[PDB]
Amino acid sequence: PKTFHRRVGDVRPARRAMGPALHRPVLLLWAIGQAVARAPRLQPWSTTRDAVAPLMEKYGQVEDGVDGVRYPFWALVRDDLWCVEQAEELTLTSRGRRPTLESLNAVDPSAGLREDDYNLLRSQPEAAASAAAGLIARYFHLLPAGLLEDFGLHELLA
DNA sequence: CCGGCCG
DNA sequence: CGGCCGG
């Protein structure tokens, strides 16, 4: 079974002219910061949307952060990095690619890291640091002022 | 294909 | 929304 480090490194978003899609990298970094702060592992869509949307806009180059967050909130399930509760309650669109924003808002499913991954992050902070550093090196190589603080990773990345 | 893009 | 683009 693949390590969390390996699963995170297998996330390879499409590279456009402007750069790779930063959606998955931003949600993963946020989720690592959440585990490190011992926030609950599963968090509602509404809470996650509200936390992550402005980071998506500021650090992820997205125009609409809400519209932005919904893509990795679902797509990370396929990358074996994420769990969405009540998934079978959602309405899918676009040939099964994704849930509608309307059904995400209505059902307000909880989601987050897999239990084994979340438990690893809390128990082995060195493993959290290396996973978050890996994402930062690959996608935020010019490291924006504010990024570590805004993702909750300042103390972690000592 | 399948995850972001864009009529 | 949901079909489209293209890495």
Numbering used by the authors: 94 to 251
Paper text:
Although there are sulfur atoms in both strands of PT-DNA, which contain a palindromic GPSGCC core sequence, only one sulfur atom in PT-DNA is recognized by ScoMcrA-SBD in both structures. The wall of this sulfur-binding cavity of SBD is lined with non-polar functional groups, including the β-methylene groups of Y164 and H116, the β-methyl group of A168, and the γ-methylene group of R117. At the center of this interface, the guanidinium group of R190 in the S187RGRR191 loop forms two hydrogen bonds with the O6 atoms of G3 and G4 of the G3PSG4C5C6/G6′G5′C4′C3′ core sequence (′ denotes bases on the complementary strand). In comparison with the DNA strand that is not in contact with ScoMcrA-SBD, the sulfur atom in the SBD-bound strand of PT-DNA is rotated about the phosphodiester backbone by 80° outward so that it fits better into the ScoMcrA-SBD sulfur-binding cavity.
The Type-IV restriction endonuclease (REase)ScoA3McrA (abbreviated as ScoMcrA hereafter) catalyzes multiple double strand cleavages 16–28 nucleotides (nt) away from the phosphorothioate linkage with the core sequence GPSGCC/GPSGCC. The DNA PT-dependent REase ScoMcrA distinguishes PT-DNA from normal DNA which differs only by one oxygen-to-sulfur swap, and presumably encodes a domain to specifically recognize sulfur on PT-DNA. The uncharacterized domain binds specifically to PT-DNA whose sulfur atom is in the Rp but not in the Sp configuration, therefore we named it sulfur-binding domain (SBD).
